[PDB]
């Protein structure tokens with residue numbers, strides 16, 4: 124299922140006894156922890172190339188993220204090698220730790236969302252993402268582990284149908300308020316400095332591009348709620364506070380649309 128023999132061949136090609144090992148189209152890490160690679164089969168190479176481009180371009184935008192170390196291709200696919208963003212993935216933070224980071228994350232994400240969207244070479248706009256969802260749902264390829272708990276036992280065709288009639292309205296809201304989004308702004312993709320709890324950088328950038336800011340905020344808030352836990356009241360305060368620091372007035376219906384669409388878009 125995972126082409127370790129092809130991928131390794133790519134990674135080992137420059138020698139130097141690096142001790143590449145799989146850590147998940149797989150992700151590998153060097154023995155010394157200083158480099159990662161993402162590798163994909165032949166069929167997915169354009170998608171990985173577009174990720175490479177996103178990472179390379181973001182390095183010219185003064186937004187903290189990895190550097191592209193190498194791009195390697197062969198008959199059995201491609202690999203994208205990047206520098207480690209050192210620190211602790213935000214999903215691994217305790218509540219207290221995530222509270223230390225919370226205003227720094229709002230600042231960092233605000234900076235990303237302040238890039239001029241019409242200057243971004245990349246897009247993850249809704250017409251693209253909705254089309255992807257139609258495809259995944261047609262292929263019966265939705266992973267229910269990604270859905271909201273209360274949706275996991277509903278057929279994804281039904282779940283797509285709940286969203287389908289809102290696409291026009293949501294496109295009009297996206298036109299009105301487009302930003303450059305991270306594109307998968309779940310807590311594991313925000314690395315924290317383990318001493319100051321400022322943001323060290325962003326990782327997993329293959330969906331970077333124009334979209335409604337809620338394509339990012341929906342994921343960030345939902346995944347932070349895994350940390351904040353049973354505390355419904357702190358979770359709402361936390362989101363209001365985030366919204367005030369970041370500079371947006373919460374639109375819950377729009378946030379929910381993005382939360383409910385995202386899972387349908389993977390596979």
Ligand SMILES: CN[C@@H]1[C@H](O[C@H]2[C@H](O[C@H]3[C@@H](O)[C@@H](O)[C@@H](NC(=N)N)[C@@H](O)[C@@H]3NC(=N)N)O[C@@H](C)[C@]2(O)C=O)O[C@@H](CO)[C@H](O)[C@H]1O
Pocket residue numbers: 268269270271272307309310311312341342345346385386387389
């Ligand atoms: C599909 N993309 C990845 C995945 O995203 C998921 C992720 O899905 C989560 C929830 O929906 C929730 O019900 C959740 N709830 C449970 N009751 N167990 C999670 O288990 C779940 N995460 C997961 N399977 N890895 O949280 C959601 C906000 C998501 O972004 C939906 O697409 O999960 C992430 C981390 O969990 C990754 O960072 C992603 O890249």
